[PDB]
């Protein structure tokens, strides 16, 4: 592998692992559209199983980039429109605060303060309807962004209704299979458990807990090889042969709202490149400016998403104009700034 890539990667990641005490880690750099893989440490400390290019990590909220692309493919299919009212696809949501909240607001966390988490007591379709009917918005729709699994989670579940398919089945057949992500899962099958890393939280081995709208907001598990293929797909959507999927990827990198230097896509978040690295909190409410109409995917962007579960920390970033990207998967949820700093330190060296 080119020594320049070898070197910047190891010189950046080795100290990161040491400083953050990460038990195991996998990295992919995509350089001029080819992937280069790196692994360190342990998928399972007790059983002494190393991280390999086959090891499954919990992506946590990097899963939202798969939800946003599946929603983009459903739009491209003419199954849904982002301008549609939520109640078009859930006419049981009759409470009047729902008037004016569209699928775009759900997808981009702008519905008016839906909360970060669906409560752990919500366990049935019935409980779910009750939660959403009782929610009282803090703000009118389309005025402030508040990152929320209950917002993009509900977008994912509604976006697949016209198809007739479960969310998992729609993701499997419309995204994972076409892109050859054959070791990417919403539910890890028994056959694949030997490759499923443990996460580590305060030194204990943990896996993500089941919860309502989990698949949609934070429940995908993948390998470093499939995540490198996901980054290639998102850097070069025109190479993708399925027309609605190619389109869906483009829709998910469109710029819908701006807060500060950041633009909100569907799952993906974007800044203009070159991106000041210092530009790149339990609840952060920010007023947003609508981009009217959304800007189609900008090639000169830093496009990224960070993800966590209790035991895992993931990061993906890529720059379309430079055909360059990175994926970092770890089995400890370590601070986001350390992820961004390491990524920028690698990509800026190679760019
Ligand atoms: N640490 C994660 C977060 O910070 O969003 C969450 N963790 C979990 C979990 O570990 O079960 C579920 C919802 S995402």
UniProtKB/Swiss-Prot annotation:
Result of altering residue 61 to D/E/G: Loss of activity
SUPFAM superfamilies in UniProt: beta-lactamase/transpeptidase-like
What is reported on the regulation of this protein's activity? Inhibited by the beta-lactamase-blocking agents avibactam, enmetazobactam, relebactam, nacubactam, vaborbactam, taniborbactam, zidebactam, and beta-lactam-analog boronic acids, via a covalent binding to Ser-61. Inhibited by non-beta-lactam, benzo(b)thiophene-2-boronic acid (BZBTH2B) and various cyclic boronates. Not inhibited by clavulanic acid. Inhibited by O-aryloxycarbonyl hydroxamates, via cross-linking of the active site Ser-61 to Lys-305. Weakly inhibited by citric acid.
Name the domain of life: Bacteria
What EC number(s) has UniProt assigned to this enzyme? 3.5.2.6
Result for mutant: residue 218 to G? Increases activity about 180-fold with respect to cefotaxime. Reduces activity about 100-fold with respect to cephalothin. Reduces thermodynamic stability
The active site annotation covers 61
Q: What is the effect of changing residue 305 to A?
A: Lowers activity more than 1000-fold
Effect upon mutating residue 64 to R: Lowers activity more than 2000-fold
Keywords, comma-separated and alphabetical: Antibiotic resistance, Hydrolase, Periplasm, Signal
Query: Any idea which GO molecular function terms this record carries?
Result: beta-lactamase activity
Q: Which PROSITE patterns match?
A: BETA_LACTAMASE_C (PS00336)
Reaction catalysed by this enzyme: a beta-lactam + H2O = a substituted beta-amino acid
A single GO BP? response to antibiotic
Tell me the residue numbers annotated for binding a beta-lactam: 61, 117, 147, 149, 308, 333
**What does the subunit comment say?**
Monomer.
- Sum up the protein's function in the record's words: Class C beta-lactamase which confers resistance to penicillins and cephalosporins. Has benzylpenicillin- and cephaloridine-hydrolyzing activity. Has weak cefuroxime, cefotaxime, cefoxitin and oxacillin-hydrolyzing activities.
Family the UniProt entry places it in: Belongs to the class-C beta-lactamase family.
- The name on file for this protein is Beta-lactamase
Name the species this protein comes from.
Escherichia coli (strain K12)
Which gene codes for it? ampC
């Amino acid at each position: 592998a080119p020594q320049q890539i070898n070197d910047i990667v190891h010189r950046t990641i080795t100290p990161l692992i040491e400083q953050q005490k990460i038990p195991g880690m996998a990295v992919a750099v995509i350089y001029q559209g080819k992937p280069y893989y790196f692994t360190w440490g342990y998928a399972d400390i007790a059983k002494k199983q190393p991280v390999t290019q086959q090891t499954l990590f919990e992506l946590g909220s990097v899963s939202k980039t798969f939800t946003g692309v599946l929603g983009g493919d459903a739009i491209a299919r003419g199954e849904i429109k982002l301008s549609d009212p939520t109640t078009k696809y859930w006419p049981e949501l009759t409470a009047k605060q729902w008037n004016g909240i569209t699928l775009l607001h759900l997808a981009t966390y702008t519905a008016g303060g839906l909360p970060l988490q669906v409560p752990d007591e919500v366990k049935s379709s019935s409980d779910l309807l009750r939660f959403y009917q009782n929610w009282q918005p803090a703000w009118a729709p389309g005025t402030q962004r508040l990152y929320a699994n209950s917002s993009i989670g509900l977008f994912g579940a509604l976006a697949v209704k016209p198809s007739g398919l479960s969310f998992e089945q729609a993701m499997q057949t419309r995204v994972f299979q076409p892109l050859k992500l054959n070791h990417t899962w919403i539910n890890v099958p028994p056959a694949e458990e030997k490759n499923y890393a443990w996460g580590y939280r305060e030194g204990k081995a943990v896996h993500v807990s089941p919860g309502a709208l989990d698949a949609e907001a934070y429940g995908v598990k993948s390998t470093i090889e499939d995540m490198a293929r996901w980054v290639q797909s998102n850097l070069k959507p025109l190479d993708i042969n399925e027309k609605t999927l190619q389109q869906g990827i483009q829709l998910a990198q469109s710029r819908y709202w701006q807060t500060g230097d950041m633009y909100q896509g569907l799952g993906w978040e974007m800044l203009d490149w070159p991106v000041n690295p210092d530009s790149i909190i339990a609840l952060a409410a920010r007023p947003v400016k609508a981009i009217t109409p959304p800007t189609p995917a900008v090639r000169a962007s830093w496009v990224h998403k960070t993800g966590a579960t209790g035991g895992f920390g993931s990061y993906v970033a890529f720059i379309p104009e430079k055909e360059l990207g990175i994926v970092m998967l770890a089995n400890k949820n370590y601070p986001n700034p350390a992820r961004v700093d390491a990524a920028w330190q690698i990509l800026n060296a190679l760019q």
